[PDB]
């Protein structure tokens, strides 16, 4: 295909850090950009520095009071904000750092600009790895996410696309995006997530939607340790059925790195190729598509995966050897562009997964 | 020149010393560069919208921010106050409890009765029975409502939680022992699959997880009924072979009678046993919470009569 | 066909407590309280495993919104909050009545986190230290570049520099210096450059130590089942485990003669098992030399008689039925376990052979700056030395005692990518097999049953009476409480069928 | 002392306790039937049958005293910690319009039912004479009986998720956090 590939990255995104022990480090995007740069792929992208979002742009989804608190919260004056902190859940789970508002504005501007470029036709493929915050829902900070830039990007895309598809591959369910579009019928949210005594707590097989959004939400409850083959065998038929019976004008893909093996908080058994497989298979359909980088806590694995997915979107395959990036020491033993899956057991069973696909297809029967 | 800069790091070091030689001995054995982006980052702004005194509250008895009194060591929450006080709108003054202010201002041990009788004769014109209570409530601190220890005890299946919340009877690698009875040694046979599916140590993949339902102890396979994981933090898992006990009739709501202590639990048996227009409160073998005895054999006639009626009404 | 239906339902449910709930549900429907959908759903959950009662039930009663579990509905008064950017289209597509709030969906109990080994924790600590160093250095370098540009412009992104200055200037003077800068830049730039130099020196040294710490730990973290394989195998390789497995299989089969089915697609693994067994027998200081020779001879004779492989090729590298007791069955189970593990290692040998031989090394910094041959100095890198044969040699070394288990497991992990962790206990399984053979020959009853097996097998041409007579002759030596096994063997395809007769012969 | 609350009323009270403390629901205020129409309907329906001047006048006195006590004590000891947020919201809105809060005009039939559950406990902490203790208990029991015949019009079984006219309303995550966080 060799689709035109846009790429958004702010050089300052790597200068904002969470708490010392926090599992979120935006610097993962920084070695991802370094890996894409040193592979000689910048000759294959148009690289953009998207304008950061303004208050009114993120007020399209979030409340004005929430935005105002976000724009004024600071680790030095947090004791002046006690009611707001507990009301908006901006406490321990989602803390406050120096560049919180700046980082949120940068991510929102990147997502908005990617959606705008898709709408205008400047490209068929745009990449923004500073997004992926799919947990915050319009009034609160959840899952280390403060602004649901995916919702804003979907809003911008819907201006020119009647139907938009959202796909979540993170082990965490896309609570914020699904909630934002739980009643509308113009947005498909499909989350492949680990369901159980897990952080999202939601995303069960019987959350297809309410009102006009009935049978318009797809949830994939998954057991621990799912490997590349099982994940592909579950992902591909469902995506094909959604493409067949819903026909979105655009698709948005959240490339969360939590599913990767060796993840700090993840529990799946997905490797490098097993994680890039879904991206390549989705790109193989031919509609305008989005990439947002969500989960992922091992910066080396997620950065390598992001670089490989960027290569795959350009119809090229990157080599296993590394181009000697700046942060070379992070890659440890052999410095190869791969992720090793571990040997732990897989609990997913063909009967349970077959039941899941049967229920999902029965729900999807009334989407065309 | 500042020497206090080198305070601490995640390495446990001032970030300026080195590998911390003890750590050395513990942890040892014995296509251009990125400086081209700034000249190629084309700032894109083609957005469509670009043109735009204790540790517990004295009322709720819980933990949180407190506004304690200097004279009364009784910490109070802000919502647990009458009226609630906004923390931003601080009173900024001498604050005392309702009991504290009553005991510190109107503390007239000799003439308290004079005020009591004054209020009593003031309310005597209209409400004499409630005058004493109307006086006394002003002498008490704000409190959180609680049931008076006997509304709760008439239902044995009700217990009070930690912070006063309501609680009921629904509060709660390769492991082959999960398929064993652990009491009789017999394998646990799932109700649906009619198998234990123990698998093997050599091939753990052949094993199918089982739950042993909490209520009726019927073992069920995690793959027989669709369920991603077990139940270990939530409520007691209930098998799908139990009565609904709550029906949303097409809207209208039906509920099963709550359990009552046997001393007050009355029983009665109908003398008809042909057809009874009674609720789901039946027993298989103050007159508001009676438990009817359904006389199981009568159910065979009743269900059959109902389905036959549905058959003939739909026939025409 | 309806009262009989009730009797059939009562028999099939098989529990008074479940039949009581079924009757309660039936009555609840009968009092015009339950609808058809829920009634049929409950009947499907009760008797739906049956296809004759439920199908008639659906066809005799004339059977012929979906709110989510984690979504609440908020009141309309709790909905309208001014959102400035929300246009009419943004108002129509957004949902505001339903919220999830995963605290509600968690039953106020919380969530359960994953279990990670200590190697992963060490990797995470190294990661955290690396990220701290690199973030500080990058932020300081960006501020250095900005100050250099300002200085170059003064010869004649609103908070990064402020954070860097505040971090560098810790005496609370940083605010004053920032204010002076806003209105004194070269001194700040030179202090930042000196701090950058110190931080880069510390980062280089720490990168060193992090690297050799990571080298000894990375492969162990991914060994999830391999770290605990020793104790799990010790617990789950008992006779009770196999008995429970076979009895559960038999019960499942009877809840509807080939309970166990083993296939042997190779004949050269037996030679490797023989070599390992003789190595252990020679090495072990627990049997006398006559006992060692008896072990070896009995093993060779039993294998040659059973599999009909050879009698001299083993020393230079019709349907038969074996009626066996517990001891012989457990010995055979040990043999089959060892054979299956070795076959699993051997089948995929070619791919690891290629991968180890075609193991490319990056020349940018590995072969230029940091060389790691810790497992290559000690020579178990599997360079050449075909992985199956090298693994056999390493197992022989481990049995001999000159190779440690730590290095054996590390080399196995590195050569097989943690896919050969079942070989960590090979020496112990061989020892258990040898002990089982010793017990088999040292007991009079097992020895007599083994002689009966020899007679029946060497007969090799018998009528249908042979099975009954063999079973009776075994039973004469055999007790009335322990269980018998019918080990059927087809020499034509080297497939072994095992049937469990607990006491069904009496 | 010995208050014979009907079993159905005890079940309703425990159901309200479960709905507030466990299901995190609050009463849909202002109530469709607050305290005054229900008490006035009771007074109109019962006092019209009484002929004794003392019995008919003491009923009015009891109704007035019940209204006064409810108005006085709702904000003191008839609200859970969760409903304190709703109380503060109502106070703020009432002060915005300079209207004094009149809780008998907001709460109804479920907070009065919970008002008469600790009356034996409330009278115990007084010097209230025994000869009028029995009168108060008997009047309370008569009112409870009158409510006991008329139950289908004050405690209906309705789902907040299926009808906005239900007596309970779901509390927002923000509402729950603010209510039970400080
Ligand atoms: Zn995630
Ligand atoms: Zn309190
Ligand atoms: Zn006080
Ligand atoms: Zn089952
Ligand atoms: Zn059960």
UniProtKB/Swiss-Prot annotation, chain A:
Signal peptide region: none
A GO cellular component entry from the record: histone deacetylase complex
How does inactivating the gene affect the organism? Heterochromatin spreading downstream of the silent mating-type locus HMR.
**Annotated region Histone deacetylase: where?**
3-315
Outcome (variant: residue 313 to A): Strongly reduces HDAC activity
Its recorded reaction(s) are:
N(6)-acetyl-L-lysyl-[histone] + H2O = L-lysyl-[histone] + acetate
Share what the entry says about its subunit structure, partners included: Component of the RPD3C(L) complex composed of at least ASH1, CTI6, DEP1, PHO23, RPD3, RXT2, RXT3, SAP30, SDS3, SIN3, UME1 and UME6. Component of the RPD3C(S) complex composed of at least EAF3, RCO1, RPD3, SIN3, and UME1. Interacts with cyclophilins CPR1, CPR6 and CPR7, with the kinase HOG1, and with ESS1, CYC8 and HAC1.
The free-text domain remark for this protein reads: The ESA1-RPD3 (ER) motif is common to ESA1 and RPD3 and is required for ESA1 histone acetyl-transferase (HAT) activity and RPD3 histone deacetylase (HDAC) activity.
Protein name listed in UniProt: Histone deacetylase RPD3
Task: Please tell me the species this chain comes from.
Answer: Saccharomyces cerevisiae (strain ATCC 204508 / S288c) (Baker's yeast)
* Gene that this polypeptide is encoded by: RPD3
Swiss-Prot record, chain B:
Q: Where do the zinc-finger regions (PHD-type) map?
A: 54-103, 187-245
Disulfide bridge map: none
**Cellular location(s):** Nucleus
Membrane spanning stretches: none
Function noted in UniProt: Catalytic component of the RPD3C(S) histone deacetylase complex responsible for the deacetylation of lysine residues on the N-terminal part of the core histones (H2A, H2B, H3 and H4). Histone deacetylation gives a tag for epigenetic repression and plays an important role in transcriptional regulation, cell cycle progression, DNA damage response, osmotic stress response and developmental events.
Quote the record's miscellaneous comment. Answer: Present with 486 molecules/cell in log phase SD medium.
Q: How does it assemble?
A: Component of the RPD3C(S) complex composed of at least EAF3, RCO1, RPD3, SIN3, and UME1.
Q: What is this protein called?
A: Transcriptional regulatory protein RCO1
Tell me the organism's taxonomic lineage: Eukaryota, Fungi, Dikarya, Ascomycota, Saccharomycotina
Question: Its encoding gene is what?
Answer: RCO1
From Swiss-Prot, chain C:
| Any Gene Ontology CC annotation | chromatin
GO BP, one example?
negative regulation of transcription by RNA polymerase II
Location in the cell reads: Nucleus
* Location of the PAH domain: 1-64
- The organism sits in which domain of life? Eukaryota
- Taking the first listed entry, what is the main subcellular location of this protein, grouped into a coarse class? nucleus
Entry GO MF terms = identical protein binding; transcription coactivator activity; transcription corepressor activity
The UniProt keyword set, sorted, is: Activator, Cell cycle, Cell division, Chromatin regulator, Nucleus, Phosphoprotein, Repeat, Repressor, Transcription, Transcription regulation
Disulfide bonds listed in the record: none
Q: How does it assemble?
A: Component of the RPD3C(L) complex composed of at least ASH1, CTI6, DEP1, PHO23, RPD3, RXT2, RXT3, SAP30, SDS3, SIN3, UME1 and UME6. Component of the RPD3C(S) complex composed of at least EAF3, RCO1, RPD3, SIN3, and UME1. Interacts with ESS1 and STB1.
> What other remark does the UniProt record contain for this protein?
Present with 1660 molecules/cell in log phase SD medium.
Q: What function does this protein fulfil? A: Catalytic component of the RPD3 histone deacetylase complexes RPD3C(L) and RPD3C(S) responsible for the deacetylation of lysine residues on the N-terminal part of the core histones (H2A, H2B, H3 and H4). Histone deacetylation gives a tag for epigenetic repression and plays an important role in transcriptional regulation, cell cycle progression and developmental events. SIN3 also has a RPD3 independent function required for normal longevity.
Name of the protein: Transcriptional regulatory protein SIN3
Q: Organism, per UniProt? A: Saccharomyces cerevisiae (strain ATCC 204508 / S288c) (Baker's yeast)
Swiss-Prot record, chain D:
Record's signal peptide: none
- Domain MRG: where? 1-180
Q: Which domain of life is it from?
A: Eukaryota
- Localization annotation: Nucleus
What does the subunit comment say? Component of the NuA4 histone acetyltransferase complex composed of at least ACT1, ARP4, YAF9, VID21, SWC4, EAF3, EAF5, EAF6, EAF7, EPL1, ESA1, TRA1 and YNG2.
Q: Which family does it belong to?
A: Belongs to the MRG family.
Q: What the protein does? A: Component of the NuA4 histone acetyltransferase complex which is involved in transcriptional activation of selected genes principally by acetylation of nucleosomal histone H4 and H2A. The NuA4 complex is also involved in DNA repair.
Q: What else is known?
A: Present with 1890 molecules/cell in log phase SD medium.
Official protein name in the record: Chromatin modification-related protein EAF3
Q: Gene name?
A: EAF3
């Amino acid at each position: 295909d060799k689709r035109r590939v846009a790429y958004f990255y702010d050089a300052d995104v790597g200068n904002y850090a969470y708490g010392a022990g926090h599992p979120m480090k935006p610097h993962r995007i920084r070695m991802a950009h370094s890996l894409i740069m040193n592979y000689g792929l910048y000759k294959k992208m148009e690289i953009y520095r998207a304008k950061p979002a303004t208050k009114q742009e993120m007020c399209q989804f979030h409340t004005d009071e929430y935005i105002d608190f976000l724009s004024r919260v600071t680790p030095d004056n947090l004791e002046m904000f006690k009611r707001e902190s507990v009301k908006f859940n901006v406490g321990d789970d989602c803390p406050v750092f120096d560049g919180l508002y700046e980082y949120c504005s940068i991510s929102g501007g990147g997502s908005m600009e990617g959606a705008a470029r898709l709408n205008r036709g400047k490209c068929d493929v745009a990449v923004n790895y500073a997004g992926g915050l799919h947990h915050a829902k319009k009034s609160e900070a959840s899952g280390f996410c403060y602004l649901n830039d995916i919702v804003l990007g979907i809003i911008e895309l819907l201006r020119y696309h009647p139907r938009v598809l959202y796909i979540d591959i993170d082990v965490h369910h896309g609570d914020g995006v699904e909630e934002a579009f739980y009643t509308t019928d113009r947005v498909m949210t499909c989350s492949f997530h680990k369901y159980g005594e897990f952080f999202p707590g939601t995303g069960e097989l019987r959350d297809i939607g309410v009102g006009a959004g009935k049978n318009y939400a797809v949830n994939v409850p998954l057991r621990d340790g799912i490997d590349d083959a099982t994940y592909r065998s579950v992902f591909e038929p469902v995506i094909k059925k959604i493409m067949e019976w819903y026909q979105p004008s655009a698709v948005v893909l959240q490339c969360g790195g939590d599913s990767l093996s060796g993840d700090r908080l993840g529990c799946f058994n997905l490797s490098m190729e097993g994680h890039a497989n879904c991206v390549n298979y989705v790109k193989s359909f031919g509609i305008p598509m989005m990439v947002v980088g969500g989960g992922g806590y091992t910066m080396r694995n997620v950065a390598r995966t992001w670089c490989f997915e960027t290569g795959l979107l350009n119809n090229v395959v990157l080599d296993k050897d590394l181009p000697y990036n700046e942060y070379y020491e992070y890659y440890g033993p052999d410095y190869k562009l791969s992720v090793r899956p571990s040997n732990m057991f897989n609990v997913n069973t063909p009967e349970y997964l077959d039941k899941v696909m049967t229920n999902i297809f029965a729900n999807l029967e009334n989407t065309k | 020149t500042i020497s206090e800069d080198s305070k601490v790091s995640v390495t446990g070091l001032p970030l300026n010393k080195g590998p911390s030689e003890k750590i050395k001995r513990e942890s040892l054995w014995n296509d251009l560069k990125t400086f081209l982006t700034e000249n190629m980052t084309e700032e894109s702004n083609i957005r469509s919208t670009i043109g735009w005194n204790e540790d517990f509250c004295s009322a709720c008895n819980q933990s949180g921010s407190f506004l304690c009194c200097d004279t009364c060591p009784k910490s109070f929450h802000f919502l647990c106050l009458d009226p609630p006080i906004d923390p931003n709108n601080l009173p900024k003054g001498d604050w005392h409890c309702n009991e504290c202010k009553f005991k510190i201002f109107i503390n007239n041990s000799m003439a308290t009765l004079k005020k009591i009788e004054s209020n009593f004769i003031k309310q005597n014109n209209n409400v004499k029975i409630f005058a004493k209570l109307l006086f006394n409530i002003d002498s008490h601190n704000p409190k959180q409502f609680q049931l008076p220890n006997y509304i709760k005890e008439t239902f044995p299946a009700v217990k009070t939680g930690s912070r006063g919340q309501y609680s009921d009877e629904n509060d709660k690698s390769y492991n082959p022992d999960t398929h064993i009875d652990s009491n009789s040694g017999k394998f646990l046979i799932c109700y649906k699959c009619n198998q234990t599916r123990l698998g093997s140590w050599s091939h753990p993949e052949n094993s199918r997880l089982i739950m042993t339902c909490d209520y009726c102890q019927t073992p069920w396979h995690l793959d027989c009924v669709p369920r991603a994981s077990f139940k270990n933090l939530g409520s007691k898992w209930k098998c799908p072979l139990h009565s609904p006990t709550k029906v949303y009739k097409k809207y209208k709501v039906w509920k099963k009678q709550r359990l009552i202590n046997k001393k007050n639990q009355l029983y009665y048996e109908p003398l008809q046993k042909i057809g009874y227009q009674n609720n789901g409160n039946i027993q298989i073998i103050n007159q508001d919470f009676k438990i009817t005895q359904i006389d199981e054999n009568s159910i065979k006639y009743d269900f059959f009569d109902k389905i036959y009626k549905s058959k003939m009404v739909q026939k025409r | 066909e309806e009262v009989t239906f009730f009797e059939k339902a009562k028999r099939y449910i098989g529990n008074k407590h479940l039949y009581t709930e079924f009757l309660k549900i039936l009555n609840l429907y009968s009092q015009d309280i339950l609808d058809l959908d829920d009634l049929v759903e409950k009947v499907d959950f009760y008797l739906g495993s049956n296809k004759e009662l439920f199908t008639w039930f659906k066809n005799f009663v004339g059977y012929q919104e979906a709110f989510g579990p984690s979504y609440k509905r908020l009141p309309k008064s709790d909905t309208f909050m001014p959102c400035s950017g929300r246009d009419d289209m943004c108002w129509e597509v957004l949902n505001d009545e339903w919220v999830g709030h995963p605290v509600w969906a968690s039953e106020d109990s919380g969530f359960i986190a994953h279990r990670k080994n200590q190697y992963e924790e060490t990797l995470f600590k190294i990661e955290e230290e690396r990220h701290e160093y690199d973030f500080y250095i990058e932020s300081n370098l960006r501020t250095i570049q900005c100050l250099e540009t300002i200085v170059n412009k003064i010869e004649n992104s609103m908070t990064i520099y402020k954070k860097v200055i505040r971090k560098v200037y810790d005496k609370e003077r940083g605010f004053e210096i920032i204010d002076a800068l806003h209105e004194t830049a070269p001194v700040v730039l030179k202090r930042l450059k000196q701090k950058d130099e110190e931080w880069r020196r510390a980062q280089r040294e720490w990168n060193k130590v992090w690297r050799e710490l990571e080298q000894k730990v990375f492969f162990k973290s991914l060994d999830h089942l391999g770290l605990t394989f020793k104790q799990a195998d010790k617990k789950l390789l008992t006779t009770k485990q196999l008995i429970s497995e076979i009895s559960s299989i038999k019960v499942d089969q009877t809840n509807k003669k080939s309970q166990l089915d083993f296939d042997f697609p190779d004949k050269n693994i037996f030679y490797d098992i023989l070599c390992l067994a003789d190595t252990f027998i020679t090495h072990t200081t627990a049997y006398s030399n006559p006992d060692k020779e008896r072990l070896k001879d009995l093993l060779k004779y039993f294998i040659s008689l059973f599999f009909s492989i050879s009698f001299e090729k083993i020393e230079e590298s019709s349907i038969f039925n074996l009626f066996a007791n517990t001891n012989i069955y457990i010995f055979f189970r040990h043999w089959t376990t060892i054979y299956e593990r070795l076959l699993e290692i051997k089948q995929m040998n070619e791919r690891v052979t290629k991968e180890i031989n075609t193991r490319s090394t990056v020349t940018f910094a590995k072969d230029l700056d940091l060389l790691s041959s810790q497992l290559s100095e000690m020579g178990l890198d599997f360079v050449g030395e075909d992985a199956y044969k090298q693994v056999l040699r390493l197992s022989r070394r481990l049995i001999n005692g000159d190779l440690e288990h730590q290095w054996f497991e590390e080399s196995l992990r590195q050569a097989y990518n943690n896919k050969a962790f079942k070989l960590y206990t090979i020496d112990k399984v061989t020892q258990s097999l040898v002990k089982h053979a010793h017990t088999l020959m040292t007991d009079a009853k097992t020895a007599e049953i083994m002689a009966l097996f020899v007679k029946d097998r060497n007969a090799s041409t018998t009528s249908a009476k042979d099975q009954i007579i063999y079973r009776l002759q075994v039973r004469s030596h055999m007790s009335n409480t322990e269980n018998m096994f019918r080990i059927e063997f087809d020499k034509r395809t080297l497939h072994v069928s095992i049937q469990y007769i607990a006491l069904d012969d009496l | 002392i010995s208050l014979q609350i009907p079993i159905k009323l005890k079940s309703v009270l425990v159901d309200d306790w479960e709905y507030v403390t466990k299901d995190k629901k609050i009463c849909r205020l202002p109530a469709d039937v607050t305290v005054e129409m229900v008490l006035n309907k009771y007074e109109h329906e019962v006092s019209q049958e009484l002929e004794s001047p003392g019995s008919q006048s003491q009923l009015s006195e009891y109704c007035a005293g019940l209204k006064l006590y409810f108005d006085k004590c709702l904000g003191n000891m008839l609200l859970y910690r969760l409903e304190r947020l709703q109380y503060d919201e109502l106070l703020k809105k009432s002060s915005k319009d300079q209207k004094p809060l009149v809780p008998i005009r907001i709460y109804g039939a479920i907070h009065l039912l919970r008002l008469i559950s600790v009356l034996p406990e409330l009278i115990s902490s007084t010097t209230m004479d025994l000869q009028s203790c029995q009168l108060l208990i008997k009047q309370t029991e008569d009112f409870l009986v009158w409510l006991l015949m008329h139950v289908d019009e004050y405690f209906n079984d309705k789902d907040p998720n299926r009808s906005d006219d239900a007596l309970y309303v779901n509390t927002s995550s923000q509402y729950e956090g603010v209510a039970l966080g400080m």
